[PDB]
């Protein structure tokens, strides 16, 4: 007894090699090793005929394509002067503000990210033929659809990733298919006679994509799952961590909209996206691991983990997936501490780089809504600032769209809350978004949804308070200037429509205390929540408001109504009688020295097209941008401009001086 | 029947790594080309009797490769050369021309 030592003898190539492996020495310094367990798994006394039959049971890739891929430089060199932070030792005396350089050490970051430990290669049927049972510090992404009839596991480590598909046919004969991505040198150890070359589908100079399955399971999976592993591996190797995360996020966002994941099908693209979610979560951990005992700049970590946080939320929405691991509490403490150094109300008074950096830190330090609602005041402060410096009615620029997209997630998180303490700021954010949702913006977003570019991923129209965006109007606002194919355009209109469904928890009001004053909600066109007043602009009369105007529309052409609600307190009943006329104003001087319209709204519509623009007069600059441009075109008699005031009055601007 | 056999343990025979102290491996051109290993008993005691049991060399080599990898942070360099030699030997042996 008392396992001590084994001697290995080799007669290879003449000279006799003799080695001595002492069990008791390397067993006392490696506590997580069991030699007898691997000896049992080995089946050392298995005959060659039986080993051969186990070997033929497993499907083998007939042809391995050699593609040369260029992996990028993800983590930059440590910035000179960066304070190094131990993820385990983070105190308030750590980095002062968002301008002082900082980086987190890689080793304690990895110890916190891959904190949990578990079995990665189970003793289940398909894996037990080829792999030895492996148990490591891991982090998994698990999801299931069709009521446990389809399951995907996304177990991963700092060195390789294994995604396992399992399908139950409701009668038996579970089908399992595993894909292993990672460095060819870091791949797990194989069992028995199996060799890695005969199992890799795609391979690079340093990376490999292995497939582990049986011939029967392979032929069964092939009827409904034929993925393009070449391009999949190519993106997994060549793309950066944050870019790959954003790519998978855009795929899932287009899937969530257009009603794709309410009844998820066992489609090839679906399972492909399931694997790509695991790869997205794996590339960040792998990049941190490839820089052992170094440190990662805080800006790179902020970007990557913002992307991962958003991706986690979306997979929790569509599939109710679970992500255990890949979350350092030290990074969260650091981000939440940096959040106390900048005041939210003036976050827009900073650099665009600083705004995006603060917003990424905001969603990373406070990932769950309801802990610190003040972050909404920050995001609004960004949007407000952008709205002041953005050309009126023009589509959003790429940089601005990305900034507003990074900021929009705290708002989306708070709009889904059943009770909030930041109602007014949500109202201001949604009013600003309604103001920014012009015809050019809708056209650019439709073009981005058609072409599949980054313009369609986010838009202020998605948080706008516009309810007059049916298909017949979206098609009219479709660009049609580019050579569009009317198929992508139809699907883009349908997707843009679905993203605005009020069935979405962030689309129904639930936070505009005046949305209850309406009795025919299917006829609401717009909601303008100003200060001390909210205007319900609808094509119906039954609105329990404080007054009732009727605008000038062409005969038999879907009349327009504006019902103001003071203090968001509904009336005891619908204001009966005859709707009052909108007073025309001609004596407004075009020259102004003070912001006399500050806090008001300016709505231009058409007699047979509908609502056209919406402006929130938020500063002297915006007022002068409106008065001193071609915005007022009194020559066109079909366009009417309405001014909405804070005491509930609606005027019609028909002349100036 | 290359140079010995691989008869599987009958369902009353017990084998344990604790009672094995010497393992002999075969090259790809020593025997007919199959990977066979021979496990030996301690060769100790009176009259110095020893018992041997042939086994699949591929499984032995894969076992020891995984063993040396799972504890590479404790390899003394001697076992590092052993790991390289075992990997090369396992790569020399090949299948599907065995059938």
């Amino acid at each position: 007894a008392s396992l001590s030592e084994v001697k290995l003898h080799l007669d290879i190539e003449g000279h006799a090699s003799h080695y001595t492996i002492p069990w008791t020495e390397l067993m006392a310094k490696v506590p997580g090793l069991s030699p007898e367990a691997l000896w049992r798994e080995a089946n050392v006394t298995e005959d060659l005929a039986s080993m051969l039959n186990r070997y033929k049971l497993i499907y083998k890739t007939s042809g391995t394509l050699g593609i040369a891929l260029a992996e990028p430089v993800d983590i930059p060199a440590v910035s000179e002067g960066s304070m190094q932070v131990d993820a385990s030792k983070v105190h308030p005396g750590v980095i002062s503000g968002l301008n002082s350089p900082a980086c987190m050490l890689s080793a304690p970051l990895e110890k916190q990210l891959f904190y949990y430990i578990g079995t990665m290669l189970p003793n289940t049927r398909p894996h037990s033929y080829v792999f030895y049972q492996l148990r490591c510090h891991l982090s998994y992404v698990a999801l299931s659809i069709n009521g446990d009839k389809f399951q995907y596991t996304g177990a991963m480590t700092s060195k390789f990733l294994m995604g396992t598909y399992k399908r139950v046919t409701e009668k038996g004969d579970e089908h399992v298919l595993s894909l292993v991505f990672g460095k060819t040198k870091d791949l797990p150890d194989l069992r028995g006679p199996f060799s890695y070359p005969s199992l890799t589908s795609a391979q690079s100079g340093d990376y490999s994509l292995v497939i582990v399955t049986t011939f029967v399971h392979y032929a069964n999976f092939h009827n409904y799952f034929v993925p393009n592993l070449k391009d999949m591996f190519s993106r997994a190797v060549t793309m950066t961590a944050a870019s790959y995360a954003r790519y998978v996020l855009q795929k899932l966002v287009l899937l969530e909209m257009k009603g794709g994941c309410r009844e998820p099908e066992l489609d090839t693209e679906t399972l492909t996206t399931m694997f790509e979610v695991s790869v997205a979560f794996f590339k960040v951990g792998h990049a941190v691991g490839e820089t052992g005992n170094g440190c990662v700049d805080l800006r790179w970590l902020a970007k990557s983990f913002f992307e991962l946080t958003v991706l986690k939320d979306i997979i929790g929405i569509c599939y109710g997936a679970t992500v255990k691991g890949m979350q350092s509490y030290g990074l969260e403490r650091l981000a939440a501490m940096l959040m106390a150094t900048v005041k939210m109300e003036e976050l827009g008074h900073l650099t665009t780089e600083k705004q995006e950096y603060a917003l990424r830190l905001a969603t990373v330090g406070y990932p769950k809504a309801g802990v610190y609602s003040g972050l909404i005041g920050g995001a609004t402060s960004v949007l407000l600032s952008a709205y002041n410096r953005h050309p009126l009615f023009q589509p959003l620029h790429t940089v601005m769209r990305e900034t507003l997209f990074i900021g929009s997630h705290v708002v989306l998180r708070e709009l889904r809350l059943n009770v909030t303490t930041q109602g007014p700021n949500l109202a201001l954010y949604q009013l600003l978004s309604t103001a920014l949702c012009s015809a050019l913006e809708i056209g650019e977003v439709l073009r981005g949804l058609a072409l599949g570019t980054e313009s369609g991923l986010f838009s202020p129209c998605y948080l706008s308070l516009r309810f007059d965006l049916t298909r017949d109007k979206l098609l009219s606002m479709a660009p049609q200037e580019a050579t569009l194919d009317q198929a992508a355009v139809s699907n883009a209109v349908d997707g843009f429509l679905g993203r605005l469904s009020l069935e979405r928890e962030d689309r129904d009001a639930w936070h505009l205390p005046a949305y209850k004053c309406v009795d025919r909600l299917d006829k609401v066109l717009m909601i303008i929540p100003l200060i001390n007043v909210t205007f319900i602009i609808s094509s119906d009369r039954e609105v329990r408001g404080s007054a009732l105007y009727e605008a000038s529309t062409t005969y038999l052409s879907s009349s327009l109504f504006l019902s103001p609600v003071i203090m968001n307190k509904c009336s005891q009943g619908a204001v009966a009688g005859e709707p009052r006329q909108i007073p025309k104003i001609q004596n407004f001087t075009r020259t102004q020295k003070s912001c006399i319209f500050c806090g008001f709204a300016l709505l231009s519509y058409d007699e047979k097209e509908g609502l056209e623009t919406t402006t929130y007069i938020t500063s002297q600059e915006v007022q002068n941008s409106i008065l001193s441009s071609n915005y007022f075109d009194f020559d066109n008699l079909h366009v009417h401009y309405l001014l909405l005031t804070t005491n509930g009055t609606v005027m019609e601007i028909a002349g100036l001086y | 029947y290359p140079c010995c056999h691989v008869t599987q343990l009958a369902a009353q025979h017990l084998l344990a790594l604790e009672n094995i102290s010497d393992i002999y491996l075969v090259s790809n051109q020593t025997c007919d080309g199959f990977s066979l290993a021979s496990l030996n008993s301690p060769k100790n005691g009176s009259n110095q009797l020893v018992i041997s049991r042939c086994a699949n060399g591929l499984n032995v080599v894969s076992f020891f490769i995984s063993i040396l990898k799972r504890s590479s942070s404790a390899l003394t360099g001697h076992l590092r050369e052993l790991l390289t030699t075992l990997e090369t030997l396992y790569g020399s042996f090949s299948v599907e021309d065995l059938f």
Partner: antibody
Amino acid sequence: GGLVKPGGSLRLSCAASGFTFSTYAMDWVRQAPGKGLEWVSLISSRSSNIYYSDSVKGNFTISRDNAKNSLFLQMNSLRAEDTAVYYCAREAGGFHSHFDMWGQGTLV
Amino acid sequence: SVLTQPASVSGSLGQSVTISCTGTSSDVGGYDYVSWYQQHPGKNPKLMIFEVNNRPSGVSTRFSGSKSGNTASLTISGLQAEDEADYYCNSYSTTTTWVFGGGTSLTVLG
């Protein structure tokens, strides 16, 4: 030939033709006026592995030719830190660490 | 490198002689592959000890070795009739793939 300076290039031959079997490993062991034995180099039967010494006595290139019944060795001369009598050695075989067949050795 | 070997063979033709050869943990103390070499004073090598204790099939007289712990002693009986030569010991050493001994010269008295 032989008898070179503290900088030399002499080609030594280990030609031994005992039988028609040349599928073993070979070695070089060297002697001097000082009574002592020291090993230098080794080649494989299938010449895929080659070993040399690792001290103030290192040494230089050896080869082998399966189709000409020979193993060969070339050496640099350190004179003072170099010997003169180089013997041949033939490795035993599988799981045996020693030599059986030998040679007479070459000149000064 | 060097394996220590003791000089000064003795014996009044009693047909018995004993000389050790101590080694390290990687050559003698932990591996059963060790050999000796005497053969003559004009030519040094001949096997003369196949293993720790094994004899080649030419030396029928009593030649044997101990290999107790970190030392390999040598016991010879039937070569006690001639002034033959020096003896050497070697083994498979993991540190350096081969290693030899310091030398033990032999001649019988009487």
